[PDB]
Design a protein around this ligand. Sequence first.
Ligand SMILES: *[C@@H]1O[C@H](CO)[C@@H](O)[C@H](O)[C@H]1NC(C)=O
Ligand SMILES: *[C@@H]1O[C@H](CO)[C@@H](O)[C@H](O)[C@H]1NC(C)=O
Lengths: 51, 65
Amino acid sequence: DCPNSSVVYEAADAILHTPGCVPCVREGQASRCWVAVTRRHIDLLVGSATE
Amino acid sequence: GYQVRNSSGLYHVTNDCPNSSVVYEAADAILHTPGCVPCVREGQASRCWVAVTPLRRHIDLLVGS
Ligand SMILES: *[C@@H]1O[C@H](CO)[C@@H](O)[C@H](O)[C@H]1NC(C)=O
Ligand SMILES: *[C@@H]1O[C@H](CO)[C@@H](O)[C@H](O)[C@H]1NC(C)=O
């Protein structure tokens, strides 16, 4: 449905299907997280930005 | 934490994941994005731009294996 941006959609889906808490550690503005996929896991760095 | 005074009473709320809030925010924003989130391979990861629901702010993220 949305194939070239899939990797994100997979991650986003894993965050929602995480019943617990996604473990994150803040790196200034951005926070580094480890999302487990239902072994393997997704590494993600998320941050906010303003123009 | 912090308190809330809504229509159903007086409450006290504590975020069980204070550092994980942007992740949940982004995950929601990706699903509410009607188009497709613009990604680019940036190394061994994927650099994406997520527009947040409304000085215009967005969410930058990198996903990897
Ligand atoms: C939140 O981030 C800070 C700074 O990276 C870290 O010291 C702390 O342990 C983190 N807290 C949680 C609940 O993950
Ligand atoms: C009451 O405030 C609390 C905390 O935000 C929430 O659990 C509850 O659903 C709110 N109720 C309404 C009607 O806003």
